[PDB]
Design a protein around this ligand. Structure first.
Ligand code: HEM
Ligand code: HEM
Ligand code: HEM
Ligand code: HEM
Ligand SMILES: [K+]
Ligand SMILES: [K+]
Lengths: 154, 155, 154, 155, 154, 154, 155
C-alpha cells in the first residue's frame, strides 16, 4: 500500500469523523427544538458519514495501514438553524477539497480502486452540498420563520 | 395526401409543442434545484404532456404524407423566479391556443375533421394548463409570494 | 462550477437534444412504414437520450450554470432505413468525440463527479454504436430486403 | 323527426358499411384459404369493425325516425391476389371517407351535432384502415411481394 | 438541570465516544484477519455504545446542558486478539466506575430519571464485562489457537 | 479501436485464461482431498474469472480486434494448500500489475469505457488478494492443521 | 490406482474439451457481435456443455490419482464466417468422437467400466452436437445462406 495513499485515506477518515459528530449533535439539537424534519434529515447525514468511515477503515486495513480514529478535528457547531447549516456547508467545502487532492495522488500512483472509493464519497458529499445550498436558498426565498415552520413536522 | 395548409398548421402547432417541452422541462428542473419540489413535479408532468401531444402531431403529419419539422426551435420563455416562470408559461399558452384555434378553422374549412379533433383535444389540455397557471398567479396575490412558495416546497 | 466544464456540459447537452429529435422522428418514420421493430427500438434510443439530457441539466444547475435548451443543431435525417441508420451512426461518432474532450477537461480541473456522469453517458453511446454497426453489418450479410422483413414485426 | 337529408346521408354511409362488411369478410376467408393467416385474421377484424359501425348507424336512423336500408347492397370490390385485395380495400375506403365528409358537412349545416359526432368517429376509424392499407402496399414495395406474403403466413 | 449531573453525563458520554471508536476499529481489525465471528460481535458492541451516546446526548439537551462530542479520550487499541479483549475490559472497568459515581450524585440531588438512564447503561456495560471475562477464560481453558479457530466463521 | 488498447485487453484476457484453469484445478484438488469449503470458494473464484474473460472478449470484438483464446501461459499449480494459496496470490500480483498498465494506456488514449471495465476487474482481483492474504494470515495465527480442519465442511 | 494409459486417454479427451470450450465460446461471441443472436446463444450453451464434461474428466482423473492436464491447449479452429465456423465445429467434433471411441476401447480392455461409462455419456453429447451441425449445414444448402442467417438473427 502506497504510504501517501494511506495518509490521504486517514485524512478523509478524520474529516468523516468530524462530520459524524457534528451532524449527530446538530440532529439532536434540532430535535430538542422541535424541528423534527431537520433533525431526521441531519441524523441520516450523520449515518451516511458513518458508512463512509467504515469503508475508509476497511480499505486502510487492506492496504496494511493503521486507521486513525484517535484524532478528532474541530466540530463546527452552530447555535441556530442558519448557522448550523452554514457550519455543515463549511465542513463539506473543506471535505471535498481534501477528497480531490486525495484522488489526484491515487491517480498518480495508479491506486485506481482507492480512487474509485473516494470518488463515490465525493459524489455523496456534493449531494450534501446541493441539499445545504438549497436549504440556505430557501431561507432567503421564504424567510427564516417559514423555513423553520416547514421543518417542524416530519 | 394531406391538404398542404393543414400540414403547415400541424407543423406550426408542433413547433409550439417543442418550445413548451423544453421551457417546462427547464423550469421544472430549476424549481427542483431551488427545493420547490411540488412545482418541480407539476411542471415535469406539463412537459411530459406536451411531449405526448408532439408525438400525436408527428404521427398525423406522416400519415398525411407531410414532413414533420423538429428542426426549427422557436424562442423559449425562461423566467428567473417563480412568478416570472409562471407568467412565461402563461404567455406561451396564450400564443399556443391562438394558433390552435386558427388551425382548427382551416381543418374545418377543408373537411379534415380528424385533424380538427386531434387539435381540439390538444386545445382542451392547453386550456386546462391556463386554468392552473391563472390559479397559481391568483394564489400568489391572495396569500403572498413567500407563503405560495412555502406551500410548494414539499411534494 | 468551472466555467469550461459548464461549457462542455452544455455542448454534450446540445448533442443530446439533437439525438432526441433525430431518433424520435426516425422512430415515427419507421412506424409509418410498418417497420415496427425498428420504430420501437429507435423510440427507446430517443428516451435514453432524454434521460441523459435530464442528468446534464441537473448537473449544470447544481454547478450554478445555465442550461442551454435553446440552440438546436442540425438533425441528420435519412430518407430510407440504411441512410437513417448511418445518420444515427454519424451523430454518435461526433457525440463520443465531444464526450472524450469534455472528460479530459473535467479530469484536468478535478471535477470527478462530472467526469463520472459523462463516462456513463459515453458507455451508453458506445452501446448505441455497437447496435448501429451491427445493424449495418446485417444489411451486408443478409441483404436489405431480408433485414427490413426482420424488422416489420415487433 | 330527424332531418330528411341527414337520414339519407346516414343510409348512404350504412350502405358503404354493408359493402365493406361483405368485402372484408370474403377477403379474410380467401387469405385463410391460402394459408395467409395473419392477413386473414387482420381482415376479419376489419369486417367486425364495419359491422359495429353499421349497428350504430342503424340505431341512430331509428332514433331519428328514419328507415334503415339494409336491402340495397352495392358493388363488392374483390381482388384475386393479395396486392389487388389490398388496393380494392383502399379504393373502397377512399370512396367511404369522401361520403363521410359530405355527410358531416350537412349534419353541421342543420345542427345535428350528435350525428356529426357519430360520423366523425367512423371517419377516424376509416382513416386508420387507410393508414394500414397504405403501409402494407408500401411494404410490398420495400421488401417485395414474396417476403411480404411470407411475413403473413403465421398469426 | 443540575450542573454536576450535566458534568457527570458528559463524562459518561466521553467514555461512550471512546468505546464506539475502540470497538469499531477492533471489529474491523478482526474482520481484516478473517476472525469474522469476533468482528461481528465487536461491531454490535460498538453500535450498542452509539445508542447509549444518543440517549446521553438527548438527556443533556433536555437538561439544557451542552453535549461535548469534541474531546475524545485515549483509545485502548490492542495488537492481537488477547490484547484487544483485555483493552476492552480495561475500558469497561473504568466506564462502570464512572457510572457508579454518576449515579451516586444523581441520587443525591434527586435526579431519578438521569439515575435510571445511567443504571440501564451500567447493566449493559456489566453484560459486556461478562462477555469479556468469559472470552479471556475460554482462551485459558481451550488455548489461544482453538479460541481463534472458533471465531473464524460467523 | 486503438491498437495498443486491444493488445492490453488481450494481455489481461491471457491472465484471466490462466486463472480460470489454475483456480478450477485447485478447486477440484481441494474437493478430492475433502477440503470442501476451500474447493467451493476456489470454484467461485474460477467462475468470476470466466465472467471477466467474457466481458474482455466482448469489448475486444466491439473494438474490432481479435480475441486471443489460443495462448495459455504458465499455470501455477501447488501441491498442498499453503502452496496453492501462495500460487494464487503470485498470479494475482502479476494480474493487478498488468491491469494498472492497461488502465494507464486507456487513460492516455481516452478509451474511458475500456478503462472502466478494467477498473471493475481490478477491484475484483484486489478482493481476491484480500481473501488470499487473509487465508495465509490465518494459517500463521491458528496453524495449518486447524486451518485445514476449518475448511473440511462447506 | 488408475491404469496409466486410461489416465492418458482421459487427459487426451480433457485436452479436446479445453479446445472446444474456447472455440465455441469465441464463435458464440463472434455471432453475438454480428447480431446473429440465435446462433450466439446456441453456441454459448455448447461451450458450457463442454465445460461440464471437462469438470467430470478432471474429477475422474484425480480420483484415479492422475494429474489433470489443463496446461496444454491445442489448436483452436476459428472460422471467418458462419459457414466456416459451423464446419470448424464439425471438424473438431469428428476428431473428438474418434478419440472418445479409442479411449472407450482401452477402458473396456482394462475393465475400467466407470471410466468407459463417463466417456460414453460425453460421446452421446458430442454426437448430438454433430447432429445439430450437419442439420445446420444442410439447412444452408436447402434454404440458402442469407435466409439461414436471417433465421438466426432473433433469439
Ligand atoms: C429537452 C428535451 C427532452 C427532455 C429532457 C425529455 C425528457 C423526458 C423524460 C425524462 C421522460 C421520461 C423517461 C422515463 O423516465 O421513462 C420522457 C418521456 C417521453 N418523451 Fe421526452 N424529453 C424531451 C423531449 C422530447 C421530445 C422532443 C419528444 C417528442 C417529439 C418527446 C417524447 C416523449 C414521449 C412520447 C415520452 C413518454 C411519455 C409517457 O407516455 O409517459 N420528448 N421525456
Ligand atoms: C348488416 C350486416 C351485419 C351487421 C350489422 C353485423 C353485426 C355484427 C355485430 C354487432 C357483431 C358483434 C361484434 C362484436 O361485438 O364483437 C357481429 C359479429 C359477427 N359477424 Fe356480423 N354483422 C353483419 C353481417 C355479417 C356477415 C355478412 C358476416 C359473414 C359473412 C358476419 C360474420 C360475423 C361473425 C363470424 C361474428 C362473430 C360471432 C361470434 O362468434 O360471436 N356478419 N356482427
Ligand atoms: C458520536 C458518535 C456516534 C454516534 C452518536 C453514532 C450513532 C449511531 C446510531 C444511533 C446508529 C443507529 C443504530 C441502530 O439503532 O441501528 C448508528 C449506526 C451505525 N454506526 Fe454510528 N455513531 C457514532 C459514530 C460512529 C463511527 C465513528 C462509526 C464508524 C467509524 C460508526 C458506524 C456506524 C455504522 C456502520 C452504522 C450502521 C449504519 C447502517 O448501515 O445503517 N458510527 N450510529
Ligand atoms: C478448464 C476450463 C473451464 C472449465 C472446466 C469451466 C467450467 C465451468 C462450469 C462447470 C460452469 C458452470 C456451468 C453450469 O453448471 O451451468 C461454468 C460456467 C461459465 N463459464 Fe466456464 N469453464 C472453463 C473455461 C471457461 C472460459 C475459458 C470461459 C470464457 C472465456 C468460460 C465462461 C463461462 C461463463 C460465462 C459461465 C457462466 C457463469 C455464470 O454467469 O454463472 N469458462 N464454467
Ligand atoms: K405556513
Ligand atoms: K424470411
Amino acid at each position: 500500500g502506497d504510504k501517501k495513499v494511506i495518509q490521504h485515506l486517514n485524512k478523509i477518515l478524520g474529516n468523516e469523523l468530524i462530520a459524524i459528530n457534528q451532524y449527530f449533535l446538530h440532529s439532536r439539537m434540532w430535535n430538542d427544538w422541535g424541528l423534527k424534519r431537520l433533525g431526521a434529515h441531519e441524523y441520516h447525514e450523520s449515518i451516511d458519514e458513518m458508512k463512509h468511515a467504515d469503508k475508509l477503515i476497511e480499505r486502510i486495513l487492506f492496504l496494511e495501514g493503521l486507521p486513525n480514529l484517535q484524532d478528532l478535528g474541530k466540530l463546527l457547531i452552530g447555535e441556530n438553524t442558519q448557522e448550523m447549516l452554514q457550519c455543515d456547508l463549511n465542513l463539506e467545502l473543506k471535505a471535498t477539497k481534501d477528497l480531490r487532492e486525495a484522488i489526484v495522488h491515487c491517480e498518480q500512483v495508479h491506486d485506481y480502486v482507492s480512487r474509485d472509493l473516494l470518488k463515490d464519497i465525493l459524489e455523496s458529499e456534493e449531494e450534501h452540498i446541493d441539499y445545504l445550498e438549497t436549504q440556505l436558498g430557501l431561507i432567503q426565498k421564504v424567510g427564516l420563520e417559514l423555513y423553520l415552520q416547514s421543518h417542524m413536522h416530519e
